[PDB]
Design a protein around this nucleic acid. Structure first.
Ligand SMILES: [Mg+2]
Ligand SMILES: [Mg+2]
Ligand SMILES: [Mg+2]
Ligand SMILES: [Mg+2]
Ligand SMILES: [Mg+2]
Ligand SMILES: [Mg+2]
Ligand SMILES: [Mg+2]
Ligand SMILES: [Mg+2]
Ligand SMILES: [Mg+2]
Ligand SMILES: [Mg+2]
Ligand SMILES: [Mg+2]
Ligand SMILES: [Mg+2]
Ligand SMILES: [Mg+2]
Ligand SMILES: [Mg+2]
Ligand SMILES: [Mg+2]
Ligand SMILES: [Mg+2]
Ligand SMILES: [Mg+2]
Ligand SMILES: [Mg+2]
Ligand SMILES: [Mg+2]
Ligand SMILES: [Mg+2]
Ligand SMILES: [Mg+2]
Ligand SMILES: [Mg+2]
Ligand SMILES: [Mg+2]
Ligand SMILES: [Mg+2]
Ligand SMILES: [Mg+2]
Ligand SMILES: [Mg+2]
Ligand SMILES: [Mg+2]
Ligand SMILES: [Mg+2]
Ligand SMILES: [Mg+2]
Ligand SMILES: [Mg+2]
Ligand SMILES: [Mg+2]
Ligand SMILES: [Mg+2]
Ligand SMILES: [Mg+2]
Ligand SMILES: [Mg+2]
Ligand SMILES: [Mg+2]
Ligand SMILES: [Mg+2]
Ligand SMILES: [Mg+2]
Ligand SMILES: [Mg+2]
Ligand SMILES: [Mg+2]
Ligand SMILES: [Mg+2]
Ligand SMILES: [Mg+2]
Ligand SMILES: [Mg+2]
Ligand SMILES: [Mg+2]
Ligand SMILES: [Mg+2]
Ligand SMILES: [Mg+2]
Ligand SMILES: [Mg+2]
Ligand SMILES: [Mg+2]
Ligand SMILES: [Mg+2]
Ligand SMILES: [Mg+2]
Ligand SMILES: [Mg+2]
Ligand SMILES: [Mg+2]
Ligand SMILES: [Mg+2]
Ligand SMILES: [Zn+2]
Lengths: 208, 157, 225, 138
RNA sequence: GGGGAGCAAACCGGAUUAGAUACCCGGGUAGUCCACGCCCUAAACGAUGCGCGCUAGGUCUCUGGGUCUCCUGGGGGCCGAAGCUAACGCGUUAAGCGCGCCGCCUGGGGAGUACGGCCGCAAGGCUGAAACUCAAAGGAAUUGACGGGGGCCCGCACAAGCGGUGGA
RNA sequence: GCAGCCGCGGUAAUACGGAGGGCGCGAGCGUUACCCGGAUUCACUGGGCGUAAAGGGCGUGUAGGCGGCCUGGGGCGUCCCAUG
């Protein structure tokens, strides 16, 4: 299925912080905070210089891992993004960011992207008044992304929206904290997303 | 103060009665990712020493690539010995779609989008040189206009 | 101080080489051939000597050093004395590298500055009488080859060579380093390699003697006195 | 024997330039002189002049170069870097308008023979016509 | 069919050599020669198809013409501009820049083999594979090593000596 | 025993076998077979033949291919427009 398994670890293979976890990825526990080397017997030993493949590969993985997502779903989007009029490097991220699983997390309903996928799949999410539970559903602009009237009372739902007390939400989005609704306004331009990815390397990895 | 890259490192043999005797060769690129790149091939008897050498040479052999918005001003094809490179400029978000060598050279030039094929001999060193020579040769509806009008330029501009 | 078309004839400046040795590129500087030898158009020589002297002058006026070069047995003592009156010169052997490998050559300068240092010194009478002579010999050669190079504390602003086809080592070096080349060029030479040309006899004393002096004359004219 | 006199013309210019000839003569022809007329406008040559060699019609092509260069080889940049015959006898090359090509991202010329004249790629594409694709230049 | 001095496959005899059954020597038939008819292959080589135009020069030579210091054609060589080349080299006798047309190539061995067809009196030739098998076969250039290759030089290395070992 | 290729294994195997650890994908992953690609390695785009494979042993010349300068007609090729 999607990847379940140990995560603060990919956090470590990519050598940067992926925020795959959640409340502690922010605390002095992400093991990036404690063991910034990669996992395994050998992560202590000095690295060999990467091959071009290596760097192209890893930059792909870093980006993909950030977003959850299977390679088959990933490659299929990069494919779709190339068929688009646009700058595919950017068009891609816009497409990624359009995922319900993601929109929800960015909205601040879920602590993390992983937790977000459940919130979706277990039916806790409204899209335009109706239920949606495919984490892959594509949110278009004008879409309203709410919490189910039912699931309004969850600890994490309420506990997370109380962090919204002092966060502010992405510039292409609008949150209705009290009403527990968010609206998807436009696609995020490249400059809005501030990921630690060199999208261009991803493109290059796929043109082999 | 540029980035350096390793195109390739090799070992090579002489001969003396009683043994092979070795020497090392390093192919090094040097760029500032905004239109200046130099290539150096240095040999010394020790590998890191060769690279030092190589790096020195690279900076003396420098070429100003006229980058036009991440890409090169027109297409171009250049032979060097057996080896031959073709550089077709490309649109945004295309990437350096180029082989092992040319990439390194192009990347450090400051190029981001470009099409490529190697052809003929694939030999690193000559492909290295063919590429550097290709870039040494690019011009601009600007560079070109001055060559052709030239002999009375500044009457129309 | 300029120069007369007449004075040039008297020098025998227009007497080229035989037709056998000959660079067709040089044709653009030839009147005709009489009895086997090409005769250099002085009407040209003169109009180039101008463009060329005009360069030499401003360069000097701005403080530039001009390296004079003549290996040929004819030139030597002319290059020498002319240089001195105030530039550097090479007149014994052109040591390959003097320009492009300038550093490790000028290294040899500090060696003789330091052996000069050692012979004015007490510390010399120390060394065994064998190293003593063998050190005077080291010094001696260095003075031979370097007595004019040792004035160059950095690459010349231009080099002025007598006979470019003899010297095209020196010349090659200059062009690789983007130093302007000036030469007294005969018919045997690629004029394309000479940034500032003077076509005319690169062979006779009476010819070089004239050119080099008027050059140098012009130099210390435009150095204030 | 001579079979392509336009090849011959182009190639005369090519070989000339590589030796930095100031000028070369080419046996005349209404057609060739048209191609030259084009090359003139676009600045690849200073111009041509019609002359007479032994009472034979010729065309003096006056070539144009770059400026002298420093470094150890000072032979000027070419202005006609590359001239090349496309439609040849024994394989003609006709192009429809939406198939007339672009030479060096707009930096070069393709010379076309059309029922409306001898046109440059741009001149032809403006008059909305195509024809025989003679040569390319840059 | 004619001719046959000299030469000389095979073959005969002498030597050499571990053995020669070859290299050396003495003989010697075909053949080499002429005519006529066949054969039609070659390192049939410039290992470079023909024709035409264009792109510095120097020098040597055979051979024409001129107002024959020199100029101007056509050959044959050497050296070289530009250029070309993997290099060696080529370089107005192109292997440079171009157009026309023909022939040919597409990994090594198998193999110029097999089969078929054509020619041939014959010997045989032209045309011409695959199965299989290898992972190379190749070209030029570099360093070295070696040569019953060359050149110059040295060591009690030989020679010139004096004295020994090998025998007891 | 591995082995697509170059190769690995003859007592220190990052190449066999097991283990730990890692990488890559994930209800799938590998293998074999076949097509296209890479293969400008049949080269129209886009290759060659002095020595790498490659100029016919040389000529004559048939079909065919190709062919100087000026002017004019035809408009087959060719090009443009409208329409099916
Ligand atoms: Mg592909
Ligand atoms: Mg430029
Ligand atoms: Mg080639
Ligand atoms: Mg563009
Ligand atoms: Mg190849
Ligand atoms: Mg290969
Ligand atoms: Mg001389
Ligand atoms: Mg059509
Ligand atoms: Mg008989
Ligand atoms: Mg016998
Ligand atoms: Mg006998
Ligand atoms: Mg006999
Ligand atoms: Mg005639
Ligand atoms: Mg003659
Ligand atoms: Mg001749
Ligand atoms: Mg030669
Ligand atoms: Mg050359
Ligand atoms: Mg010719
Ligand atoms: Mg060829
Ligand atoms: Mg075959
Ligand atoms: Mg085979
Ligand atoms: Mg055969
Ligand atoms: Mg045979
Ligand atoms: Mg045969
Ligand atoms: Mg048979
Ligand atoms: Mg029969
Ligand atoms: Mg035959
Ligand atoms: Mg060999
Ligand atoms: Mg020897
Ligand atoms: Mg003795
Ligand atoms: Mg004795
Ligand atoms: Mg005894
Ligand atoms: Mg295995
Ligand atoms: Mg393995
Ligand atoms: Mg193992
Ligand atoms: Mg395990
Ligand atoms: Mg595992
Ligand atoms: Mg193909
Ligand atoms: Mg072709
Ligand atoms: Mg080939
Ligand atoms: Mg052979
Ligand atoms: Mg061959
Ligand atoms: Mg032949
Ligand atoms: Mg043959
Ligand atoms: Mg016919
Ligand atoms: Mg016809
Ligand atoms: Mg015709
Ligand atoms: Mg007509
Ligand atoms: Mg008509
Ligand atoms: Mg009509
Ligand atoms: Mg018609
Ligand atoms: Mg048509
Ligand atoms: Zn984490």
């Amino acid at each position: 299925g999607r990847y379940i398994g140990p995560v603060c670890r990919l956090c470590r293979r990519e050598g940067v912080k992926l925020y795959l976890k959640g409340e502690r990825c922010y605390s002095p526990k992400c093991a990036m905070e404690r063991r910034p080397y990669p996992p395994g017997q050998h992560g202590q030993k000095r690295a060999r210089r990467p091959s071009d493949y290596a760097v192209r590969l890893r930059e792909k993985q870093k980006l993909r891992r950030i977003y959850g997502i299977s390679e088959r779903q990933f490659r299929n989007l990069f494919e779709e993004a190339s068929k688009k009029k646009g700058v595919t490097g950017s068009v891609f991220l816009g497409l990624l960011e359009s995922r319900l699983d993601n929109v929800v997390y960015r909205l601040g309903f879920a602590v993390s992207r992983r937790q977000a996928r459940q919130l979706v799949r277990h039916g806790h999410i409204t899209v335009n008044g109706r239920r949606v539970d495919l984490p892959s559903y594509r949110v278009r602009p004008g879409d309203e992304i709410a919490v189910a009237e039912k699931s309004r009372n969850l600890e994490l739902i309420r506990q997370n929206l109380e962090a919204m007390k002092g966060r502010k939400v992405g510039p292409w989005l609008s949150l209705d904290v009290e009403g527990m609704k968010g609206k998807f306004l436009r696609l995020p331009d490249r400059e809005d997303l501030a990921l630690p990815v060199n999208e261009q390397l991803v493109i290059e990895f796929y043109s082999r | 103060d540029f980035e350096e890259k390793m195109i390739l490192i090799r070992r090579t043999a002489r001969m003396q009665a009683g043994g092979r005797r070795f020497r090392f060769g390093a192919l090094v690129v040097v760029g500032d990712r905004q239109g200046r790149v130099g290539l150096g091939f240095g040999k010394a008897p020790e590998v890191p020493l060769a690279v030092q050498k190589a790096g020195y040479y690279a900076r003396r052999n420098m070429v100003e690539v006229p980058l036009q918005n991440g890409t090169i001003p027109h297409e171009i094809e250049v032979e060097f010995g057996a080896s031959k490179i073709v550089l077709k400029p490309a649109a945004p978000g295309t990437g350096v779609i180029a082989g092992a060598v040319p990439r390194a050279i192009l990347e450090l030039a400051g190029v981001t989008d470009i099409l490529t094929k190697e052809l003929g001999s694939r030999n690193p060193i000559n492909i290295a040189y063919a590429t550097m020579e290709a870039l040494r040769q690019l011009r601009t509806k600007a560079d070109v206009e001055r060559l052709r009008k030239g002999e009375a330029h500044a009457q129309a501009q | 101080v300029e120069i007369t078309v007449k004075e040039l004839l008297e020098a025998g400046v227009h007497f080229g080489h035989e037709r056998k040795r000959w660079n067709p590129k040089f044709a653009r500087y030839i009147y005709a051939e009489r009895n086997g030898i090409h005769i250099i158009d002085l009407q040209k020589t003169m109009e180039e000597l101008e463009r060329t002297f005009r360069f030499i002058e401003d360069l000097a006026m701005r403080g530039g050093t001009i390296l004079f070069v003549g290996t040929k047995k004819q030139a030597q003592d002319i290059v020498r004395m002319e240089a001195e009156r105030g530039m550097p010169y090479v007149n014994q052997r052109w040591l390959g590298g003097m320009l492009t490998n300038f550093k490790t050559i000028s290294q040899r300068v500090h060696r003789l500055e330091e052996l000069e240092a050692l012979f004015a010194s007490p510390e010399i009478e120390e060394r065994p009488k064998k190293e003593q002579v063998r050190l005077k010999h080291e010094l001696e050669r260095l003075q031979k080859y370097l007595s004019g190079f040792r004035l160059l504390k950095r690459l010349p602003d231009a080099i002025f060579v007598v006979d470019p086809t003899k010297e095209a080592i020196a010349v090659r070096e200059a062009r690789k380093l983007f130093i302007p080349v000036i030469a007294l060029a005969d018919t045997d030479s690629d004029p394309d390699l000479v940034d500032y040309i003077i076509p005319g006899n690169d062979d006779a004393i009476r010819s070089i003697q004239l050119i080099l002096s008027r050059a140098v004359d012009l130099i210390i004219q435009a150095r204030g006195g | 024997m001579l079979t392509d006199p336009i090849a011959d013309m182009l190639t005369r210019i090519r070989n000339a330039t590589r030796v930095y000839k100031e000028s070369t003569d080419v046996p005349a022809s209404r057609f060739k002189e048209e191609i030259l007329r084009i090359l003139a406008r676009e600045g690849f040559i200073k111009g041509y002049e019609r002359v007479d060699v032994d009472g034979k019609p010729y065309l003096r092509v006056y070539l144009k170069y770059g400026p002298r260069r420093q470094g150890p080889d000072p032979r000027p940049e070419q202005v006609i870097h590359h001239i090349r015959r496309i439609s040849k006898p024994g394989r003609r090359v006709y192009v429809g308008v939406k198939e007339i090509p672009r030479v060096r991202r707009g930096l070069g010329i393709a010379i076309l023979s059309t029922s409306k004249g001898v046109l440059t790629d741009r001149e032809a594409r403006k008059l909305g016509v195509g024809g025989e694709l003679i040569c390319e230049v840059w």
